């Protein structure tokens, strides 16, 4: 079956860094664009970042622009999110989600059909 699993969560102080990983299987990770979406406690879903199949198209939310760094390793079928200079409002549940079709914006066109279980990230002093 299709499957995504996020790793790298934990508690980290405001200003420090943390890197998240997403292991993929069950589908051709070589061709699909993948995205990060977080769920803040008390708030709703919030899109974090996106990266195309060849990393030729990359986008960030304004709240994490110049703060997070998305990347991928198609050989390892893994997606990464380097979070530096974390803030209290970055405390959320980060999801790894693939689109219905391999295009970059196609996950917005036809929805995000597959989601991972998520990895918790806490940013408190």
């Amino acid at each position: 079956e299709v499957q995504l699993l996020e790793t790298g969560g934990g508690l980290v102080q405001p200003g420090r860094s943390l890197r998240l990983s997403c292991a993929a299987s069950g589908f051709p990770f070589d061709d699909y664009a993948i995205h990060w979406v977080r769920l803040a406690p008390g708030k709703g879903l919030e899109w974090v970042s996106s990266i195309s199949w060849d990393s030729g198209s990359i986008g960030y939310a304004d709240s994490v622009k110049g703060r997070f760094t998305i990347s991928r390793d198609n050989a390892k079928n893994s997606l990464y999110l380097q979070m530096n200079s974390l803030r209290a409002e970055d405390t959320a549940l980060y999801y790894c989600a693939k689109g219905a079709f391999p295009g970059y914006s196609s996950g917005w066109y036809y929805g995000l059909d597959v989601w991972g279980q998520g990895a918790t990230v806490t940013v408190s002093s």
């Binding site: 879903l45 899109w47 219905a100 279980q117």
Partner: protein
């Protein structure tokens, strides 16, 4: 940006409830690419509607989508116990996506 969504919705068993999703002319009212997601507690979201009114395989006919101006709506007829969950809308916004605030659906 921000997509306005009522914090809570309610409907009795077998009745209907509509969940609105209000954006601007650059997201909800600028494209026909509104999605709806269901999230049960402790579980990952599930795609229920894409392209405003299209249903993926595995979604019952009770869920239906519509849009009118900057406001997209999700109607759930014949409400059932398993429909109690959180519902978020999504919309395209020009190489970027944006989610709604979310609505807790209570089946009374």
């Amino acid at each position: 940006s921000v997509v306005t969504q009522p914090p809570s919705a309610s409907g009795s068993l077998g009745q209907s409830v509509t969940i609105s999703c209000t954006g601007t002319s650059s997201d909800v009212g600028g494209y026909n690419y509104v999605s709806w997601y269901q999230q049960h507690p402790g579980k990952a979201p599930k795609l229920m509607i894409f392209e405003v009114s299209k249903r993926p395989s595995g979604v019952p006919d009770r869920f239906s989508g519509s849009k009118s101006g900057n406001t997209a709506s999700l109607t759930v007829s014949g409400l059932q116990a398993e429909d109690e969950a959180d519902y978020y809308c999504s919309s395209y916004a020009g190489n970027k996506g944006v989610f709604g605030g979310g609505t807790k659906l209570t089946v009374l």
